[PDB]
Scaffold this active site. Structure first.
Site, PDB file in Angstrom:
ATOM      1  N   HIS A   1       0.861  -1.328  -0.040  1.00  0.00           N
ATOM      2  CA  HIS A   1      -0.030   0.083   0.008  1.00  0.00           C
ATOM      3  C   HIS A   1       0.808   1.415  -0.126  1.00  0.00           C
ATOM      4  CE1 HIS A   1      -3.431  -2.878   0.754  1.00  0.00           C
ATOM      5  NE2 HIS A   1      -4.145  -1.623   0.575  1.00  0.00           N
TER       6      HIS A   1
ATOM      7  N   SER B   1       3.285  -7.870  -8.069  1.00  0.00           N
ATOM      8  CA  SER B   1       3.815  -8.820  -8.640  1.00  0.00           C
ATOM      9  C   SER B   1       3.193  -8.852  -9.838  1.00  0.00           C
ATOM     10  CB  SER B   1       3.832 -10.017  -8.036  1.00  0.00           C
ATOM     11  OG  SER B   1       4.839 -10.191  -6.762  1.00  0.00           O
TER      12      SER B   1
ATOM     13  N   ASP C   1      -5.179   6.537   0.958  1.00  0.00           N
ATOM     14  CA  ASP C   1      -5.424   5.004   0.473  1.00  0.00           C
ATOM     15  C   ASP C   1      -6.950   4.911   0.603  1.00  0.00           C
ATOM     16  OD1 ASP C   1      -5.726   2.141   0.738  1.00  0.00           O
ATOM     17  OD2 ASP C   1      -3.469   2.415   0.616  1.00  0.00           O
TER      18      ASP C   1
ATOM     19  N   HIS D   1     -19.956  -4.340  -6.650  1.00  0.00           N
ATOM     20  CA  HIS D   1     -21.001  -5.241  -6.787  1.00  0.00           C
ATOM     21  C   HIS D   1     -21.484  -6.162  -5.573  1.00  0.00           C
ATOM     22  CE1 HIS D   1     -20.282  -3.618 -10.978  1.00  0.00           C
ATOM     23  NE2 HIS D   1     -21.543  -3.380 -10.698  1.00  0.00           N
TER      24      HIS D   1
END
Length: 438
Positions: free
Chosen positions: A14, A338, A107, A140
């Site tokens: 983060h 990654s 964030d 959703h």
């Protein structure tokens, strides 16, 4: 001198994205203050030593740290309470200084920061560090279009590829924190009507259609990814480089399998044995970076048995290893960082997702971006040594090996194009900087 605040959540994957964005902002003339905890300023390489560096602002005393007796819920509840007061105290002195901050980027996982910014009349934007596809899934789930276990075996979300239940995020990996994580992730869209704009750690060519959907929520959406350092003299008393690089340097180009399931996944010895044996059976050169507590679960005599073929170490820089020409494939857990690294360095992948958004990133890597394949797992979730060996062979030696490598070099080109001068991401960052100078 225009200056803004960036407030990342102090956790794995983060901080780096917000730090990278901060570096792009500083390069376009914006001074950046990074709001963080005592532990991050201390226990991390946040030095901010040069005069053009990000300014580190420690606003906590360390009483917000996670206790051994804490559940995820109690930790996040205390963090929110203490950091809210800490940010309120910080802004009190800063919103009445000679040069007040003109914006705060925080964030997206801390939506309570928007309320503090709103209370002080400070322009603000949440930063979504995960894939935009995850923003669609979480939104959703929040609004009932998707359910924890899906009613329908095929899920069709607006502007998204079809997904089965095995392609949706697995928040059940750590059973104690399942409901907490889902509430955390679904609460990132509750106050976006008051956000100046939304920042996403992705690029238009990668998830353009999903970003278009996100814009239909009512606010401007700015792709500013990927957040990978643009970088990707002669000492007589020191060697040129690291041990990993040197070992890779003696291998033929495109031959070694770089293996890493990240610094957070705790794998089971049973599954860990089969995975090691799977890698052993291939007979390919491989560099496996694995931490001390995971390395103890490796089968007895494993590293000695792969003496010539395998280099098993506790650390190497993932970026320099992935950028090495001797590396031809990445056996990865498919974490978003990654995942973006693989795409940015044009390296095909053997997807071995473990938990959370990794399964969704794997789905896109295999079926949408087509740069590799997912290790087939059984009903028990155990990937057998033949499946592991087979998958590695298929991506590196099989029918589609040239396909995967061709797709990877294409995604690598578009990714560099996005962050290069005039690219979709650079353009979004320049427009934001232009508004901050207004």
């Amino acid at each position: 001198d225009t200056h803004i605040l960036v407030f990342p959540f102090p956790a794995q994957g983060h901080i780096n994205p917000l730090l990278q964005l901060s570096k792009h902002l500083i390069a376009k003339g914006i001074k950046v203050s990074l709001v963080t905890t005592l532990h991050v300023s201390n226990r991390m390489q946040l030095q901010g030593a040069y005069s053009n560096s990000v300014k580190i602002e420690v606003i906590s005393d360390g009483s917000e740290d996670r206790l051994e007796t804490d559940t995820l819920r109690q930790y996040l509840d205390r963090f929110r309470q203490k950091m809210t007061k800490n940010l309120e105290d910080f802004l009190q002195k800063a919103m009445v200084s000679s040069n007040p901050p003109k914006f705060i980027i925080y964030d997206s996982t801390m939506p309570w920061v928007l309320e503090v910014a709103k209370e002080f009349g400070l322009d603000r934007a949440p930063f979504y560090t995960q894939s935009c596809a995850l923003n669609s899934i979480n939104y959703h789930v929040l609004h009932g279009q998707l359910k924890l276990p899906p009613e329908t075996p095929t899920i069709s979300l607006p502007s998204m590829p079809l997904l089965r239940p095995s392609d949706l995020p697995a928040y059940d990996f750590d059973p104690a924190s399942t409901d907490t994580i889902i509430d955390l992730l679904t609460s990132q869209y509750s106050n976006i009507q008051d956000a100046n704009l939304l920042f996403c750690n992705t690029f238009d060519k990668l998830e353009g259609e999903i970003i278009q959907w996100m814009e239909t929520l009512g606010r401007p959406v700015k792709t500013v990814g990927p957040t990978v350092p643009s970088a990707y003299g002669l000492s007589l008393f020191k060697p040129n480089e690291d041990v990993c690089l040197k070992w890779l340097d003696s291998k033929p180009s495109g031959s070694v399998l770089y293996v890493s399931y990240g610094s957070l996944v705790e794998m089971g010895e049973e599954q860990l044995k089969e995975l090691a044996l799977g890698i052993k059976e291939t007979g390919k050169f491989f560099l496996w970076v694995v931490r001390d507590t995971e390395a103890e679960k490796l089968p007895p005599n494993f590293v000695e048995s792969v003496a010539e073929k395998g280099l098993v170490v506790s650390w190497c820089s993932q970026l320099e290893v992935l950028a090495h020409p001797s590396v031809g494939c990445f056996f990865t857990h498919c974490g978003w960082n990654s995942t973006l690294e693989a795409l940015c360095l044009g390296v095909p992948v053997v997807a071995f997702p473990q938990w959370a958004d990794q399964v969704t990133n794997a789905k896109f890597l295999e079926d949408v971006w087509k740069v590799g394949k997912r290790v087939k797992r059984n009903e028990q979730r155990l990937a057998s040594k033949e499946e592991v060996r087979s998958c590695i062979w298929e991506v590196m030696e099989g029918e589609r090996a040239s396909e995967f490598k061709s797709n990877s070099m294409e995604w690598k080109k578009w990714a560099k194009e996005a962050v290069d001068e005039g690219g979709s991401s650079d353009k979004n960052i320049e427009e934001f900087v232009a508004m901050l100078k207004q």
